């Protein structure tokens, strides 16, 4: 169920931004999706999420290895 898997993944890509980087990004939706193989499955996403209420595009890179309870995300920034 790939796009299920996909948009979980934005929205743990927004949550870890925002834990990080001590911000409050809303998620709204995905809107492109790459999905490589590496040494674990390799994310890049590009998502709308709202910035103090105006929506805005972000790219996002998240690492994933569905062998354990193991998600990372590598890169977040504003397209």
Known sequence: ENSLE???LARFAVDEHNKK??????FVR???????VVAGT???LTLEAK???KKKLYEA????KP???????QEFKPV
Do not use: S
């Open 67 to 73: 062998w354990e309870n193991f998600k990372e995300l």
């Open 42 to 44: 390799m994310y890049y």
């Open 51 to 53: 910035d103090g209420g």
């Open 61 to 64: 890179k998240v690492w994933v």
């Open 21 to 26: 980087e001590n911000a409050l990004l809303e």
């Open 6 to 8: 996909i948009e979980e």
């Open 30 to 36: 995905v809107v492109k999706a790459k999905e490589q």
